[PDB]
Amino acid sequence: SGLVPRGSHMNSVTVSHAPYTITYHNDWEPVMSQLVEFYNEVASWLLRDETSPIPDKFFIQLKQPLRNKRVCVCGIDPYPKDGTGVPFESPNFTKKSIKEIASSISRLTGVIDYKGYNLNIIDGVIPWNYYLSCKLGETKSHAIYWDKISKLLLQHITKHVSVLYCLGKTDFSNIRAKLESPVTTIVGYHPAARDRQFEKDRSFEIINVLLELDNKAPINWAQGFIY
Amino acid sequence: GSHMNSVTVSHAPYTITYHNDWEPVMSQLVEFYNEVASWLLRDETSPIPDKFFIQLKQPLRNKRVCVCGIDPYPKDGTGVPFESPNFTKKSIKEIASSISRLTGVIDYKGYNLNIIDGVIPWNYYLSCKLGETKSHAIYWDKISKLLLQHITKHVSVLYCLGKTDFSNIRAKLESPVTTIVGYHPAARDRQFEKDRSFEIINVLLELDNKAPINWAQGFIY
């Protein structure tokens, strides 16, 4: 209020294929020249098929600052269909993962009435997709293309966040992301997994415990609720 | 989709590669260019014919501001509007100075409007006879209207540099769009209006609920 936005923290790079221009918050600058090289190597293979999300939305999460992030909530790749470029986001609130996440937070907070939930509007949380695209309707089908980019980006995230929360024990097998320093990590169940309500609920609960051990402020998960 | 297409024309450069966002005007452009090309290629041009249309390789879907000068540099035009690889041309140095004064960037070696997210720099006429500004208005006439009309369907703000340069252009758009006609970058003693004309583009974008331009993305260090 009073200051006119001028995007002073937003940089951009050119790449050889769609989306041709990647814009990104300054906090990502240390990895972008490597990302450009990797993406130019592989973009041809990626763009052959219809993807979730569309190529113009591959990189929009890089607009998010990292210096104000203390939790990363990470799934393996986008929704097989209707990915928006924002991890876990479902505008019409139909995808099973974000509905299950909302139910968990509802049980943890006591919030009963809501119409949606979005991990991307929570102070201190960056929601993340390890792989930034999938072939339309086929989960993890673009693992081989994103491989080195995914390691690069996750490694950069874990230099900023205090807690990394991975969703899907099977999904995150063998990713080999070489982190530079060990970071507090929880590998929990997939949000759409069956019969593990208690452990899904409790996985979110422990994150704030872990943050306080690190002398970091808790997450207010209720900020994600859409009314 | 988002990819490159191609069309053939009867004269040099014989083939025009373009981003698919331009597809709706390409058959009309071919017809128009074949009509005029012979008269056009008689003279040495800026840029060379192989670079007439390379700016059509830009997407429009990710563009919200068009910065538009009337035609290419009298000499050394690259096909990228305003671009000067050795940073010698007056207009881009003046633009760079404005942006330097707006943003506070002190040290830089160059500036390019073509590397800024959301900006498509543009030349109304895509060529001039070598050494003579506006020499090819007659040839580009209908094409220039066709392309600018198409650009303003995508961008939210159109910024034309040169009040006299753009007098009687008559390019008449299908639907009005937010436009600003400022002074030529090399104009004398109008630093405050030149600096301010860039500043208010972000104000206008905010009104349209569009993301601001970071003009500092143009600097080359």
UniProtKB/Swiss-Prot annotation, chain A:
CDD domains: UDG_F1_VAVC_D4-like (cd19372). Changing residue 169 to V: About 90% loss of processive DNA synthesis but unaffected UDG activity. InterPro entries: Ura-DNA_Glyclase_AS, Uracil-DNA_glycosylase-like_sf. Changing residue 196 to V: About 60% loss of processive DNA synthesis but unaffected UDG activity. It is an enzyme of class 3 (hydrolase). It catalyses: Hydrolyzes single-stranded DNA or mismatched double-stranded DNA and polynucleotides, releasing free uracil. The keyword Ion transport does not apply. Keywords: DNA damage, DNA repair, DNA-binding, Hydrolase. PROSITE patterns: U_DNA_GLYCOSYLASE. The active site is at 77 (proton acceptor). Homodimer. Interacts with protein OPG148. Component of the Uracil-DNA glycosylase(UDG)-OPG148-polymerase complex; OPG148 and UDG form a heterodimeric processivity factor that associates with OPG71 to form the processive polymerase holoenzyme. Plays an essential role in viral replication as a component of the DNA polymerase processivity factor. Excises uracil residues from the DNA which can arise as a result of misincorporation of dUMP residues by DNA polymerase or due to deamination of cytosine. Belongs to the uracil-DNA glycosylase (UDG) superfamily. UNG family. This is Uracil-DNA glycosylase.
